[PDB]
Structure 1
C-alpha cells in the first residue's frame, strides 16, 4: 500500500480528536492548571536519519538504531538542520501536479527514540502518544511492531500504545515523508518544510475516562444571567455508580458546581446517549470575556464514583462571551466589533515553523501594544498553546482549517471533487473538536484560496450544525459565496473596483450594498506589507469607522518569513526564496510582515498602531473632544498628555485624567495657551498614556496620539543686513561664485553645481543633479522578473520609458550679477530616443549672507509614466553622526504613509535614517520637512528627504541588504515631491491617483546655507 498517495486514506489506527487533555488525578491540580504527572513530554534528543525515498529505508531501522544516524532536537524541521533544502514557492506546487501522486524521489526522515515507561503506567488504564504536528505524513512503529498512520500537518495525531509498550526500555520508530496526498491540501504561501516540528508526548488515561467534553455559555438579553452548559462523554465500562461533576471557579472562589450520573436526554426513537451527560450551571452577573478584558473562569470536569473516589479530571479556561450576527453586524456580547487584526504564520528565523512560548508571548505582546485585537491563524490550526494565550491575553481568533489548494487549475478542482471530501472533512472536523472550548476563537474558517466547491458548502453546514456559537467564514470563490457568514475579501480596495471575471474584487464600500447583500464585511487579508509598504492604510481605517458593516480586517501579515543563513566568516544574514538553491521559487514574496523575523518593528507597524487607536479626537477652539472606541471597558488606566510647540520649542504642557465610557465622549477644556510674538507654526500634540503596567504593557505606555496646527504667525521682518557681496568668475567652462571662504562652482558644460568649498575643503563627491527615479520598492516591481516581464508594473513602465537611463542634455546655463547676489540660471532636458521626458528649469541665488537659494520648476510630459520623484541628489563629502530635522518623524514616512509621524524637532543617529529591508529599495524618507541639518550643512524650505551611505543605484542593484557596502560620504535625496508607496496589494500597481505625480508642472524652493 502507498497510503501517502491515497486521498481516501488519511489515518490508520488514529484515535478520535478531542479538546486538550492532561488527565489530572487531583482536582486542585486541574483547577490551577498545574502540570500533570499523567502528561509526559518526549521532547528532547532523538535519532534522525535522512533518506531520498521510503523504499531506501532499511528493514533494520524498525528494531535497532542506525549507526550513521545523528542526534537532533525534536521538535524541528529537518531543513533547518541542513539535511535538505527548504523551498519557497507561493502559488505553484513544489511538486508536479499529478493528484493524488507524489514524486518517487520523496525525502524521507527517520526519527527514532529510546524512552522509559514506568511499571505503574501499564498496570491499569490506557497509554497513548500525541504527535502535535508532523509534516506531512507519517507511519509509526513501537518496539518494531506497526502502530498507525496520519496526515494533516497541523493537528494532533494520537495513537494507543497500550498493547505495544513494555516496562522499561521502549523504542519509537517514526517514518516521516515530505510529500504526500496530504500535500495537495497544504499549498499555503510559505516555506515548504517537513519533519516532527511540534511536541511529542505521552498521556495516561484510566480505562473508564472522559473521552470528550463541550462547554457552552448562553446568556439573557442584558448579559446579567448566564448558563454554562457542559456536555461530557465517556469511554470504558458504564456503571450506575459513575458520576460527573463540573465546577466553575472565579480564580479561587467556586461560583457553581453540579453533579449527575451518566445518561442524557431522550433524543430519538432508540433512546438517549447512556454514555453522555449534560450539566447546567446558573451564573449570575458573569464577568464577560472580550479582547478588551479577558475575564476567565476555570471549569473543572471530574469523573468520580458516587462515594467520592476521583477517577480523572479535565479542565479548561472558560470565557463568558456571545458571538452572533444580527442585522448584518458581527456582535461580541451584543456590541458590534471592530477587528484590528493581523494574519500570523508560525515562523521563526532559526527554528523554522517550530513554535515556543517565548516567541508566542513576544508576538502577542507586540500585537496588543500596537493596538491589535485579533489574529487570523493563516492558514492552519496553530500549536495548542497559542489559543490558551489568546484566551489569557485577549485577542480574537479566526481558527482556520488546513486547506489550501492554490496551485490547482482551476483553484476549486479538488474542492468540488467529492472524491476529496473525506480528507477535507477530516481537516475541518478535527480542528473543531480540538479548539471549540477556546473563548478566543470567535470565527471558524474553512481554509484559504481553494476556490469554491460543494465540499465547502457541505462542511460549512457541518460546523453550523455542530457549533452554532460561531460564524463561519471562507474567502474562496469570490469571498461572498454561500460558504461564508461574512463577506471576507482579500486585497479588496476601499474605493477602487477590480472587476475580475467570475471573482471580482469590488470596492469594500460598494460590496456591502450590492443588490440583496446583507452580510458584514471583514477582510481576511489586506494591506500587503511587503517591503516598504502599507501606503493608503489610513483610507482603510477611515472607511471602517464610517461604515457600521465594514468591521475591520486582518493585515497581511505579521512577520517576515526570512530564514537565517551564514557566510564564510560565519556572519548571519537573512535569506529569502531561492537562497537555498530551491527552484522554482518566488524570491522575496515570503517577506510580508509588519516586523522583521527577529520581531524588530518595520516602520509600517507605527502607522498600523496609529490608525488602530481606540481613541479618536476632535479639536474646536481649544476644547478637546475624546471619543472612546472601546465597547466594554472605561478608560480607567488612561491619561491625556497635551503639549503645544512653536517650531520645536515647547511652550506649555499639561496632563488631564481620562474618564470616558465605552462609545462615549469627554470634553477637555484647555487652559489659555500662550500666543507668542515669534514667527512660526504652533502645533498641538496629545497623547493617551497608560500610567499603570498591564499584563501586556509597561507603565507610561502610549496608546494614541494626534496633532493639529494651532495658530501660525508668518515672518514679516526682513532678513538680517548683509554688506558682503559674492563675486562672480566666468571661465570658458565654469561659473564660479566666491564669498569669504565659501566657493560655489557651476560646470558650464553639464549645468549643475559641480563643487562646493568651505575653506580648502571639498563638500561634494558627485555633482548636485536632478532625480526623477527611485530604487524600486516591492510595490514598484510587483510580480515582474527579468525573465518574465510584467509591462503593467510601475518599474517596467519607468524602464521602457527610459526614466532610468535618461541623459540630461543642457539647454541653458547663464549667470548674472545683482546688487547683492549672483543669479545662476540653468535649464536641462532628460531625453530618451528623441522623446523629451522631463524639463528642469532652475534659478540659483547666492547672496551676501552665505545662503544659496534654489528655485526648481519641472515640466513632466503627460504621456510619460508619472515620475517616482521630483527632487535632486548629491553625494556629500562630510560624514556627520547626527541627522537633525524639523518635519514629519521620527520613523520612516511617505506621502501615503505619514499619519503616524509627528511634526517636531527630531535628532537621530545617521543609521536610523536608513531602513534595513532584506530586499533593498528606496527607504528612510521623511516627509513634510522645513529644515534639515547634516554636519556643517543646512537645508530649509518645504520638502521630503532621505539620507544615507547608499546610492539609489546601489540599492536598486543590490538584492540582499547584507551585500550593501557603505560608500564614501553621504548620499542625500531631497525631493520637492515623492510618489506614493502603495500596498493594497503587491502584484499590480496600487498607488492611488492622489499619490501619483500627474500634475505635469511642479515647483519647489530650497535654501542651502552653512552654520
Structure 2
C-alpha cells in the first residue's frame, strides 16, 4: 500500500507505545487453534514495548526461542475520536505480525523493519477499551527477507539458523500506535527536488488524497510561503532555494491539504531541496563531489535487542557528531524512521538498506544458492516487496542519497545475475531520483563478481589483514590497493568502502600491535586510510562498526562482534580518537588530498 508518517495536527496519535504489555511464549503452537486473541493472555508476564523480547528477561530459553510469541494489551479509544478515520499502526514488528482487535483480525505483515497499519474505524467504538493481541513470528526461511532455515530436531523443537552476522532479535521493536484522520485524507506524497547550479530550482509534487482536492504550499524554516500549487496531483514549484546540505540540512516544509466538500485534511512534509547524482567516479550532492565518512551501524544495545530508544539515539548522534562522521548506512535492515528524521534535520547523509543480507552460503546446506530449494522466484518477489516497502517509506527523506538492495550476496554463480538484474531495474523504476547499489562481499572481488555493473556506485566490504593476510598490514595494504584499482578500471564508478574494521577487545593492549588489540585496530584503519587517499575512485569510508553488537554464538565471535569503535555501552576504544582526528581534520564533505 501507501505509507505516510503519522504527524499531528488535524490528525492525532495515541501512543500505546506505552511499554507494558502482556507476553507469553507459544511453545506448543496452541495459540491460533485456541484463539488466544479471544481472551486475556494466560500465563503472561510483563514486557516492554518498543523492544526486542529476547534480552528483557535475562533468560537463555526465551532468548533462543524460535516460533510464536504473544503480546497483549487493553487500550482506550479517545472519546473525541467520534467519526474520524481511526488507524492502528505498527512501525515495526520483527519478522511477522498478526494483529487482532477483540477477536477481529485486522492486519498481517511479513517484514521485520517497516510499518504496517489498518483502518480500524469500523472495529472500535470511541470511549471504549479494546483488547489488542499481536502474534509475532521470528522464523526465517528461503522466502523471508532476510533468509534462514529453521531446523527442527528429532524432538520437534525448532532452532533458527541464519547466515548474517547479527543476532536474530525479534518482537515489537518500534512504536505501535493508534492514529486519526478525517474521512478525506492525504495518504501518499512523492516529492522530487531539482537544482540547477544552485541559484534556482523546481520541486515537483505528486499527491494521492483519498477523496480530496489538494493544494500545496512551501514554507521556509522561518515559516513564510515561498511557493504555491494546485494541480492537486502533479504540481511543480520554482524557488530561489536554501539547499538541504550535508553540513546543515536546511528544511523547507510542504503543506498538503485534502479538501472534501465538508472535510479538511492537513499534512506537513519536511522537504530538503537537494540533488543526488553520480557523475563518472564522483558522488555529487547539490552538484558538488562529496566524500562519505562514518559508520555501518546496527540497531543494538544492552537489554534492548533492536528496540528503538530516544536516549540511545540522542547519545549515538552526539558520538557520531563528535567523531566527525558525516554519514552512515542502515546496515542490514531499514532503521527506525526517527533516525531518518534526525538525519534530515541535521544534514546527515544516509545509505538506506533493505533487510536483504544472508543471500550467501559461503560467509563462514543447499548446494545451489539460486535454486528452487533456496533463492528462487518467490524469494525474488519477497525481495522486490522489501524494496517497495522501504522506498515507499523513505522516498521523501532528503538524507537518503542512495538505496542499497542487499548486503553481500554470493555473486559467483550464474543466476545471481538472473536474480538481481530484475531487482536493479525495478528499484530504479521505484525511485528514479537516487543511485542504487548492492553491497559487495570480499570474496566476490573485482575479477569474480558478476553483478556490480548493474548498479551505480560500488560499495565494498573489505577485510584484508583480518580474515585474510591476518595480522599482516604490509601485504594487506598491497592486496587492498591492487583490488580497489582493479574495480576502478573495471567499472569507473564511485567506490565507497562501506565496511572496514577489525575485532578489538577494549582494554586489550599490545606492544606487538597484533590482532584484537586496540593498537592493531588503530594501525589497521590507518593503513586502510593511506590507501583510500591514494585512490581517486574512493569517495567514502564507513568503518565497520559504530559499536560492538550481539551475534549468534560461535568460535569467531567473543561474546559478539567486536569491531566497534565504541563498546556496546558506548565507551570509546582508542581508535575512536584516531577517527576523530582524520574526520574533524578534513575539509567537511571533502576528500583528503592524499597527504596530511
TM-score for both structures, normalised by structure 1: 0.50
Whether 2:550 is the aligned partner of 1:544: answer no
On the 8 A contact 2:293/2:326 being kept in 1, the answer is yes
Compared with structure 1, are the counterparts of its residues 144 and 612 closer, same or farther at alpha carbon in structure 2 (3 Å cutoff)? same
Residue number in structure 2 paired with 1:155:
114
Compared with structure 1, are the counterparts of its residues 139 and 425 closer, same or farther at alpha carbon in structure 2 (3 Å cutoff)? same
Whether 2:217 is the aligned partner of 1:247: answer yes
State the secondary structure of the residue aligned to 2:489. Answer: coil
If asked which structure has higher relative contact order (CA below 8 Å, sep 6+), I would say 2
Q: Give the Å deviation of 1:78.
A: 1.7
On the 8 A contact 1:51/1:57 being kept in 2, the answer is no
On the 8 A contact 1:614/1:630 being kept in 2, the answer is no
Residue number in structure 2 paired with 1:382:
335
State the secondary structure of the residue aligned to 1:536. Answer: helix
Q: 2:243 aligns with which of 288, 300, 303?
A: 288
The one-character-per-residue Cα deviations of 1:11-36 (angstroms, maximum 9, x if unpaired) are xxxxx1423132631xxxxxxxxxx5
Whether 2:310 is the aligned partner of 1:350: answer no
Cα distance in 2 for partners of 1:57, 1:83 equals 27
Cα distance in 2 for partners of 1:425, 1:591 equals 32
On the 8 A contact 2:21/2:71 being kept in 1, the answer is yes
State the secondary structure of the residue aligned to 2:125. Answer: coil
Compared with structure 1, are the counterparts of its residues 253 and 447 closer, same or farther at alpha carbon in structure 2 (3 Å cutoff)? same
Residue number in structure 2 paired with 1:299:
254
Compared with structure 1, are the counterparts of its residues 154 and 47 closer, same or farther at alpha carbon in structure 2 (3 Å cutoff)? same
Whether 2:139 is the aligned partner of 1:179: answer yes
Residue number in structure 1 paired with 2:6:
21
Compared with structure 1, are the counterparts of its residues 347 and 521 closer, same or farther at alpha carbon in structure 2 (3 Å cutoff)? same
Q: Give the Å deviation of 1:416.
A: 5.5
Q: 1:610 aligns with which of 577, 581, 588?
A: 581
The one-character-per-residue Cα deviations of 1:646-670 (angstroms, maximum 9, x if unpaired) are xxxxxxxxxxxxxxxx999xxxxxx
Q: 1:128 aligns with which of 87, 91, 95?
A: 87
State the secondary structure of the residue aligned to 2:76. Answer: strand
State the secondary structure of the residue aligned to 1:279. Answer: strand
Cα distance in 1 for partners of 2:526, 2:555 equals 36
Residue number in structure 1 paired with 2:74:
114
Question: What does 1:736-815 align with in structure 2 at a 5 Å threshold?
Answer: none
The one-character-per-residue Cα deviations of 1:154-175 (angstroms, maximum 9, x if unpaired) are 1112122222223302111111
State the secondary structure of the residue aligned to 1:608. Answer: helix
Cα distance in 1 for partners of 2:133, 2:589 equals 53
| Greater fraction of residues in helix | 2
Compared with structure 1, are the counterparts of its residues 53 and 378 closer, same or farther at alpha carbon in structure 2 (3 Å cutoff)? farther
Q: 2:399 aligns with which of 411, 422, 440?
A: 440
Compared with structure 1, are the counterparts of its residues 107 and 416 closer, same or farther at alpha carbon in structure 2 (3 Å cutoff)? closer
On the 8 A contact 1:43/1:201 being kept in 2, the answer is no
The one-character-per-residue Cα deviations of 1:843-863 (angstroms, maximum 9, x if unpaired) are xxxxxxxxxxxxxxxxxxxxx
The one-character-per-residue Cα deviations of 1:138-169 (angstroms, maximum 9, x if unpaired) are 22211112223211111112122222223302
Compared with structure 1, are the counterparts of its residues 135 and 85 closer, same or farther at alpha carbon in structure 2 (3 Å cutoff)? farther
The one-character-per-residue Cα deviations of 1:486-542 (angstroms, maximum 9, x if unpaired) are 122211659x999xxxxx987344224435x22111112113354322433223323
Q: 1:402 aligns with which of 355, 358, 368?
A: 355
| Greater fraction of residues in strand | 1
On the 8 A contact 2:295/2:544 being kept in 1, the answer is yes
Whether 2:317 is the aligned partner of 1:332: answer no
Q: Give the Å deviation of 1:310.
A: 6.2
Q: 1:457 aligns with which of 404, 410, 421?
A: 421
On the 8 A contact 2:182/2:263 being kept in 1, the answer is no
State the secondary structure of the residue aligned to 2:324. Answer: coil
Residue number in structure 2 paired with 1:199:
175
Cα distance in 1 for partners of 2:384, 2:115 equals 15
Q: 1:359 aligns with which of 295, 312, 316?
A: 312
Show structure 1 runs of 4+ deviating over 6 A: none
Q: Give the Å deviation of 1:250.
A: 1.5
Cα distance in 1 for partners of 2:147, 2:589 equals 39
Question: What does 1:472-551 align with in structure 2 at a 5 Å threshold?
Answer: 472-476=436-440, 478=445, 481-491=452-462, 493=464, 507-515=482-490, 517-531=491-505, 532=517, 533-551=521-539
Cα distance in 2 for partners of 1:492, 1:591 equals 14
Residue number in structure 1 paired with 2:433:
469
Cα distance in 2 for partners of 1:417, 1:86 equals 33
Residue number in structure 1 paired with 2:273:
320
On the 8 A contact 1:380/1:447 being kept in 2, the answer is no
The one-character-per-residue Cα deviations of 1:678-722 (angstroms, maximum 9, x if unpaired) are xxxxxxxxxxxxxxxxxxxxxxxxxxxx8xxxxxxxxxxxxxxxx
State the secondary structure of the residue aligned to 2:526. Answer: helix
Across the aligned residues of Structure 1 and Structure 2, the Cα RMSD in angstroms comes to: 3.1
Whether 2:49 is the aligned partner of 1:74: answer yes
Compared with structure 1, are the counterparts of its residues 555 and 413 closer, same or farther at alpha carbon in structure 2 (3 Å cutoff)? farther
Residue number in structure 2 paired with 1:235:
210
State the secondary structure of the residue aligned to 1:313. Answer: strand
Cα distance in 1 for partners of 2:528, 2:186 equals 47
Q: 2:380 aligns with which of 413, 416, 421?
A: 421
The one-character-per-residue Cα deviations of 1:332-391 (angstroms, maximum 9, x if unpaired) are 112211111211001111222112121112111111211111101111100110001111
Residue number in structure 1 paired with 2:549:
561
Cα distance in 2 for partners of 1:183, 1:521 equals 26
Whether 2:186 is the aligned partner of 1:210: answer yes
Cα distance in 2 for partners of 1:425, 1:196 equals 23
On the 8 A contact 1:493/1:506 being kept in 2, the answer is no
On the 8 A contact 2:501/2:563 being kept in 1, the answer is no
Q: Which has the larger radius of gyration?
A: 1
TM-score for both structures, normalised by structure 2: 0.82
State the secondary structure of the residue aligned to 2:208. Answer: strand
Cα distance in 1 for partners of 2:42, 2:468 equals 62
State the secondary structure of the residue aligned to 1:474. Answer: strand
Residue number in structure 1 paired with 2:26:
51
Question: What does 1:565-644 align with in structure 2 at a 5 Å threshold?
Answer: 578=553, 586-615=557-586, 628=587
The one-character-per-residue Cα deviations of 1:181-206 (angstroms, maximum 9, x if unpaired) are 43653743112222112111012222
State the secondary structure of the residue aligned to 1:443. Answer: strand
Cα distance in 2 for partners of 1:203, 1:350 equals 29
On the 8 A contact 2:481/2:531 being kept in 1, the answer is no
Compared with structure 1, are the counterparts of its residues 305 and 528 closer, same or farther at alpha carbon in structure 2 (3 Å cutoff)? same
Whether 2:169 is the aligned partner of 1:169: answer no
Gapped regions of structure 2 (runs ≥ 5): 149-162, 362-366, 470-478, 506-516
State the secondary structure of the residue aligned to 1:482. Answer: helix
On the 8 A contact 1:140/1:149 being kept in 2, the answer is yes
Cα distance in 2 for partners of 1:456, 1:559 equals 31
Cα distance in 2 for partners of 1:345, 1:204 equals 32
Q: 1:430 aligns with which of 386, 389, 398?
A: 389
Compared with structure 1, are the counterparts of its residues 492 and 602 closer, same or farther at alpha carbon in structure 2 (3 Å cutoff)? closer
Q: 2:97 aligns with which of 138, 147, 163?
A: 138
Cα distance in 2 for partners of 1:526, 1:300 equals 42
Question: What does 1:860-879 align with in structure 2 at a 5 Å threshold?
Answer: none
Q: Give the Å deviation of 1:56.
A: 5.3
Q: Give the Å deviation of 1:442.
A: 0.6
Compared with structure 1, are the counterparts of its residues 71 and 39 closer, same or farther at alpha carbon in structure 2 (3 Å cutoff)? closer
Gapped regions of structure 1 (runs ≥ 5): 1-15, 26-35, 89-93, 95-104, 237-241, 263-276, 499-503, 563-575, 616-627, 632-661, 665-705, 707-1011
